[PDB]
Amino acid sequence: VGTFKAKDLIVTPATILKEKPDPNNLVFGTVFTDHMLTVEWSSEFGWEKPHIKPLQNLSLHPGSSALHYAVELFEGLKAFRGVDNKIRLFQPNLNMDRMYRSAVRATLPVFDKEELLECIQQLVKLDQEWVPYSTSASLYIRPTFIGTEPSLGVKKPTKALLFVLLSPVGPYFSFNPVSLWANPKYVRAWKGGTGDCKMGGNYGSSLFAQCEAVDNGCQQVLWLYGEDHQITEVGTMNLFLYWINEDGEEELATPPLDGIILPGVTRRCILDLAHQWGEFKVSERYLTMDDLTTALEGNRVREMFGSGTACVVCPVSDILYKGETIHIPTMENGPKLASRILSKLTDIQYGREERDWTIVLS
Amino acid sequence: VGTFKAKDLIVTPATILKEKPDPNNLVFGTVFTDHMLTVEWSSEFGWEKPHIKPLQNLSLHPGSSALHYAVELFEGLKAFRGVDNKIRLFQPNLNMDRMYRSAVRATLPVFDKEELLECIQQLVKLDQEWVPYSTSASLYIRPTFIGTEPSLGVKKPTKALLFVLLSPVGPYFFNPVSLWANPKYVRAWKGGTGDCKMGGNYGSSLFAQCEAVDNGCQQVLWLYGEDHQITEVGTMNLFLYWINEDGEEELATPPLDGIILPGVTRRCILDLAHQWGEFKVSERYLTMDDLTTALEGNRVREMFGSGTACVVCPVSDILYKGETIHIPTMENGPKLASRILSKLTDIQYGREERDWTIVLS
Ligand SMILES: *Cc1c(COP(=O)(O)O)cnc(C)c1O
Ligand SMILES: *Cc1c(COP(=O)(O)O)cnc(C)c1O
Ligand SMILES: O=C(O)CCc1ccccc1
Ligand SMILES: O=C(O)CCc1ccccc1
Ligand SMILES: [Mg+2]
Numbered sequence: 001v002g003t004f005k006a007k008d009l010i011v012t013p014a015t016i017l018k019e020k021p022d023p024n025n026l027v028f029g030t031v032f033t034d035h036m037l038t039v040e041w042s043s044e045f046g047w048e049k050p051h052i053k054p055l056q057n058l059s060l061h062p063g064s065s066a067l068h069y070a071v072e073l074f075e076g077l078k079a080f081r082g083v084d085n086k087i088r089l090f091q092p093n094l095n096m097d098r099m100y101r102s103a104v105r106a107t108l109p110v111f112d113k114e115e116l117l118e119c120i121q122q123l124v125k126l127d128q129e130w131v132p133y134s135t136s137a138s139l140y141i142r143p144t145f146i147g148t149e150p151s152l153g154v155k156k157p158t159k160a161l162l163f164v165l166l167s168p169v170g171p172y173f174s175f176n177p178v179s180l181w182a183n184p185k186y187v188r189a190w191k192g193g194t195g196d197c198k199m200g201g202n203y204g205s206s207l208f209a210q211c212e213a214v215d216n217g218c219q220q221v222l223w224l225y226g227e228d229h230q231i232t233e234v235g236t237m238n239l240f241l242y243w244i245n246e247d248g249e250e251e252l253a254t255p256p257l258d259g260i261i262l263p264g265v266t267r268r269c270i271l272d273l274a275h276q277w278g279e280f281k282v283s284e285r286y287l288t289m290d291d292l293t294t295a296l297e298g299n300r301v302r303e304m305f306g307s308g309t310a311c312v313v314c315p316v317s318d319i320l321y322k323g324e325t326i327h328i329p330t331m332e333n334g335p336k337l338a339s340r341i342l343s344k345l346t347d348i349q350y351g352r353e354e355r356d357w358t359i360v361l362s
Numbered sequence: 363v364g365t366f367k368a369k370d371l372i373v374t375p376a377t378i379l380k381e382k383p384d385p386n387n388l389v390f391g392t393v394f395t396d397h398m399l400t401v402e403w404s405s406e407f408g409w410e411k412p413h414i415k416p417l418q419n420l421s422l423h424p425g426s427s428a429l430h431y432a433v434e435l436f437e438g439l440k441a442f443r444g445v446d447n448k449i450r451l452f453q454p455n456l457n458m459d460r461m462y463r464s465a466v467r468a469t470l471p472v473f474d475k476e477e478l479l480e481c482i483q484q485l486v487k488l489d490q491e492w493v494p495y496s497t498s499a500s501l502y503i504r505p506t507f508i509g510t511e512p513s514l515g516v517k518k519p520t521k522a523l524l525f526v527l528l529s530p531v532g533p534y535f536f537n538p539v540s541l542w543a544n545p546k547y548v549r550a551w552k553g554g555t556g557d558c559k560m561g562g563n564y565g566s567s568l569f570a571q572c573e574a575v576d577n578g579c580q581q582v583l584w585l586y587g588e589d590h591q592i593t594e595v596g597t598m599n600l601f602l603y604w605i606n607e608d609g610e611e612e613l614a615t616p617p618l619d620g621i622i623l624p625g626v627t628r629r630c631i632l633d634l635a636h637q638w639g640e641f642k643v644s645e646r647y648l649t650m651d652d653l654t655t656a657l658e659g660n661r662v663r664e665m666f667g668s669g670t671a672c673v674v675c676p677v678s679d680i681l682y683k684g685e686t687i688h689i690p691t692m693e694n695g696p697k698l699a700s701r702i703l704s705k706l707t708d709i710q711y712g713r714e715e716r717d718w719t720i721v722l723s
Pocket of ligand 3: 312
């Protein structure tokens with residue numbers, strides 16, 4: 001057991017540089033930077049030294065287990081160029097904590113979280129001119145970790161690769177509210193499954209549901225669970241509901257961490273904000289379609305929104321379910337809370353206000 | 363171009379051929395033959411021509427969606443060298459049907475099933491001396507299909523690679539196995555993708571499979587629901603031979619309700635067992651309680667797995683809730699299991715005629 005170490009970094013700088021794109025025209029996940037990070041591991045010898053080097057294709061044995069049995073996991077986080085022109089990461093240690101836990105769930109080897117973070121910082125620092133010059137764009141950071149065992153046995157891999165990609169991305173907006181496809185025939189995650197980790201195999205199974213959703217005029221899938229049709233998540237975002245609850249109290253509600261919900265960083269931040277403001281009840285609790293339709297009949301719903309790293313906050317206007325369109329009155333209610341959370345988090349990400357949630361580049 | 367064709371195959375033979383392994387030293391899945399099949403697809407241009415070429419690494423964009431969101435799926439079938447020295451496939455059209463259906467569910471591009479089986483046969487023929495000269499060994503064929511979309515959004519890929527590897531194998535692991543049963547982990551769920559061979563179903567199973575080895579088990583027995591239904595034996599279908607609750611002799615296996623892989627072996631064994639008509643045959647739910655109550659009454663004769671890699675794998679023991687639960691499979695012959703193994707191998711190795719085999723092209 002052990003870890004690679006950032007002090008052993010080997011840097012092979014590119015000698016031909018790609019042109020930076022316009023920050024207003026960026027499509028998500030499609031343009032990549034000049035460099036990547038790579039680190040090899042074998043059970044025989046452990047972790048090899050980390051490399052930063054020019055972006056390149058991966059050379060993989062076709063029997064690699066990432067390709068047959070989904071022995072894989074990823075993370076997502078961002079670097080933000082401040083109004084003061086300092087580049088900041090936001091809650092990055094939470095992503096490392098999650099990554100490590102995911103590795104263990106997947107049977108990939110463990111590593112030292114602080115050491116990975118430092119390696120990420122030096123990567124971003126080398127490609128730092130790729131962090132956009134714009135207050136509603138950013139650099140998305142994709143750490144990825146795959147089994148490369150050359151063998152078709154289903155088992156723990158004895159070889160693996162950890163790598164990191166960088167991709168400048170732009171605003172999810174200029175506030176666009178979404179319609180949701182709620183079809184109970186599909187289930188993202190089950191008790192005793194891996195839905196509370198960022199493991200590749202949770203996502204394969206959902207491209208078909210996203211396609212069905214667009215064919216019916218919807219932008220995202222609302223994931224339902226169990227016999228009472230609990231509402232769990234929105235696409236790949238956590239779900240919040242701002243309403244007057246069944247006892248007539250103003251409440252922010254979100255599903256609890258009971259194994260079928262991914263514990264988002266955004267989710268966490270929001271809950272901490274809500275707790276600290278102390279202005280309404282905050283509840284991690286079960287929410288069903290009927291709870292929801294009953295609330296709508298009695299004018300109790302203020303706002304519904306997704307949260308996650310790509311969107312930050314994503315207002316919901318409509319849910320399609322049992323052959324009908326159910327309107328959600330989010331945009332008619334400001335959306336006051338959603339806009340508050342958005343301006344608070346973006347103020348922090350871009351250094352418009354001080355916070356312990358940000359780290360300035362190393 | 364909506365589908366590739368076998369007649370466009372481009373064959374690049376290898377310069378130096380590797381030495382074949384010993385048929386009685388084979389570790390499943392570890393030795394590969396001289397050549398592979400590869401077919402590139404893109405949204406814009408459709409399917410490129412298929413190529414048979416030397417086994418090589420794949421060169422993949424690190425953004426490739428197979429690596430991030432498990433946009434991927436596979437199959438598993440076998441070629442068998444006959445006692446008559448004719449090489450045969452076993453119900454391969456069923457694997458093609460299943461691969462196509464799973465592609466549709468993965469949002470991978472569709473392909474002409476016949477043309478793929480033809481390409482596969484041409485790949486086997488070129489590597490035919492790898493089909494081992496032994497009647498307890500075979501050549502494993504591994505069609506595999508991955509998204510190679512170089513962009514990070516979760517979406518239908520606009521680039522894909524279809525490839526086939528071949529691997530000589532003996533057994534997968536009568537060697538009876540012991541099974542680890544921990545209901546804390548679930549393999550697949552209703553409204554999920556457990557009824558197809560998508561790579562995501564296997565990623566999540568690994569932790570449990572390691573936990574099984576830590577306890578001296580060879581496999582995981584997958585349990586489901588609050589009543590602890592017994593679903594599958596690792597990656598094999600599960601069969602139970604017993605006296606049922608109405609006092610009838612019965613072969614039982616879980617029904618195809620979404621959480622169970624519809625194995626080719628499983629379907630053969632049910633056909634055989636209907637054909638013999640010596641005992642009841644039921645696709646029904648079975649629980650750990652059904653099992654332990656039956657054992658207490660000395661009602662259980664045999665329990666075994668069945669899948670391509672291991673056609674019949676008997677089960678002696680299950681570890682559950684801190685106890686070991688002995689299963690008396692090996693002290694009842696195991697007659698049924700042996701009858702089944704002997705018939706399927708008779709067919710697969712050509713000792714009898716059958717509509718389930720196809721002789722190599
Ligand atoms: C990544 C992800 C989220 C959002 O998590 P953040 O850490 O806030 O970006 C939500 N749900 C699912 C299923 C996810 O994969
Ligand atoms: C492959 C597989 C089977 C049986 O497969 P065959 O087509 O009979 O080889 C059963 N269960 C699971 C989970 C599998 O992956
Ligand atoms: O970050 C989010 O809003 C959802 C998580 C996500 C983002 C990009 C690709 C896959 C998952
Ligand atoms: O054939 C089986 O019994 C299960 C299918 C399988 C075999 C080997 C590796 C992955 C899946
Ligand atoms: Mg045709």
